[PDB]
Write a protein that binds this ligand. Structure first.
Ligand SMILES: Nc1nc2ccc([C@@H]3CCC[C@H]3C(=O)O)cc2s1
Length: 165
């Protein structure tokens, strides 16, 4: 069960934790991956989640692309969670450093509403270049189901809690 979270709003909770370790302890119904449109999990949260499955997530993802084609920015797909969760919801936030529209961050977070409870990272807040505090605001304004956010970096976590509480 989710332990040590701080409740920010009626439905958004936050913890300073590594999402891979949270997934292995809780084994939630849904873990969110911060993915790209071809589901190539090369680094960031995507690389860490794929490595914790010993590349099983990548083999499954390449088969999903071969049959279905790439996702759209703001879109998602549900695949196995392997040893981390029952399911992995792979969500594509905009890569604003490559000119993708920040408005698509709202569409990205809307995918979370299809699941009652999710363990997730902040979208577009890694190498995708969005300001992480702006990404948390979009999450709060868009997600209506129960989301447990895991923020690895303690300096970032303290910044987020100071601005949202
Ligand atoms: N093993 C892990 N590797 C990563 C890499 C990056 C991150 C996320 C991506 C966006 C914000 C950052 C964070 O929470 O500090 C979390 C994790 S957990």
């Amino acid at each position: 069960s989710f332990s040590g979270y701080l409740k920010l709003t009626d439905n958004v909770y936050i913890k300073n934790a590594d999402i891979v370790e949270e997934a292995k302890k809780v084994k939630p119904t849904v873990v969110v991956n911060a993915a790209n449109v071809y589901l190539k999990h090369g680094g960031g949260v995507a690389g860490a989640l794929n490595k914790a499955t010993n590349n099983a997530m990548q083999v499954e993802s390449d088969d999903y692309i071969a049959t279905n084609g790439p996702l759209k920015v703001g879109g998602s797909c549900v695949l196995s969670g392997h040893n981390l969760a029952k399911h992995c919801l792979h969500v594509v936030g905009p890569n604003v450093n490559k000119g993708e529209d920040i408005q698509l961050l709202k569409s990205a977070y809307e995918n979370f509403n299809q699941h009652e409870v999710l363990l997730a990272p902040l979208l577009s807040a890694g190498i995708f270049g969005a300001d992480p505090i702006h990404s948390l605001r979009v999450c709060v304004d868009t997600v209506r189901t129960n989301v447990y956010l895991a923020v690895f970096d303690k300096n970032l976590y303290d910044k987020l809690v100071s601005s949202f509480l």
